[PDB]
Amino acid sequence: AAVILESIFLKRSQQKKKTSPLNFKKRLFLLTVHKLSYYEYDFERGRRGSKKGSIDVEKITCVETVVPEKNPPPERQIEQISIIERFPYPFQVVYDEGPLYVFSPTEELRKRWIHQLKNVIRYNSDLVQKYHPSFWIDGQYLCCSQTAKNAMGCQIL
Ligand SMILES: *[C@H]1CCCc2occ(C(=O)O)c21
Ligand SMILES: *[C@H]1CCCc2occ(C(=O)O)c21
Ligand SMILES: [Mg+2]
């Protein structure tokens, strides 16, 4: 399928460990009408490396912004170099295996990805009308305090 979008984002680890600290990984993200996939990027040759995972577009229920972290490290705090080193703008892709947290280098790039992702899931069956506006961190959602990753969203839209 045709490539709609191709960008380098920071990805928060999902099942690294149940209680261990959260890891953040630099990934090349690809969007087609069929899948949202991510790879280790091969910087030296200027091409995508090994595929590290995928999300079938049909399984996505929600795509929105996330309220940013209160104390972010320099890599996630607000040019050719800045675009591949700082990732301050998070968004969420909600599916069956909880939300995937993605960090964009710019506001414009996040907006573009949210816009296109909303169009590819337009005819999805499982789309929800509620979401969690804040991150799931240290066993709970910061917005509602619910302890289930698959918990129903606390806010409308
Ligand atoms: C990231 C890279 C090592 C293997 C692995 O297993 C789970 C995860 C993750 O959730 O990102 C990773
Ligand atoms: C990211 C999150 C889902 C599980 C997984 O396995 C490998 C990787 C990675 O290396 O990014 C991930
Ligand atoms: Mg630097």
Ligand SMILES: [Zn+2]
């Ligand atoms: Zn919530």
